[PDB]
């Protein structure tokens with residue numbers, strides 16, 4: 001790809017975070033805490049899963065950012081509608097307002113309904129996310145493998161403003177404590 005030059009500075013929105021998440025001072029890293037993080041509840045917080053949104057809202061143009069996933073066992077990344085459900089159980093799908101990929105149990109999958117198997121030869125340590133609002137495209141790139149394409153959602157029906165979307169995953173195994181980190185431009 002050659003999408004780096006639509007690079008945007010993403011920061012995480014504390015107010016949307018699940019109450020067990022710990023967001024760094026610079027709002028560029030997030031990890032799972034070992035307990036509730038002593039915050040009040042609010043209607044924006046994802047209740048059931050270790051999810052958080054970016055602060056930025058996009059309704060036009062081309063946007064690109066990169067996320068470090070080094071030594072994690074489980075995570076979800078992509079974009080979602082500003083109006084996605086926050087409370088209770090739900091699946092990650094375009095019908096529910098999400099355009100995501102994930103790692104789970106040694107397999108990478110795209111969040112279609114039902115999910116799509118991804119074919120990645122070089123396990124990624126950093127993921128690039130490209131959104132073309134006007135074209136209705138969300139694409140995922142393997143920065144560890146010279147920027148190779150992972151997956152493209154096309155004909156997307158955004159139906160509203162978009163926000164960067166993150167899930168650090170649970171840490172039942174003790175092997176998934178590592179943070180998600182927004183990489184420098």
Ligand SMILES: Cc1nc2[nH]c(C(C)C)cc(=O)n2n1
Nearest residue numbers: 041042043044045047087088
């Ligand atoms: C399922 C569900 N969880 C909540 N939590 C709250 C606040 C206490 C944040 C309002 C609300 O309507 N719901 N609905």
Ligand SMILES: Cc1nc2[nH]c(C(C)C)cc(=O)n2n1
Nearest residue numbers: 049050090091092167169170
């Ligand atoms: C949408 C979604 N569904 C789940 N389910 C679980 C476990 C209960 C399997 C963790 C998680 O992060 N998510 N995110």
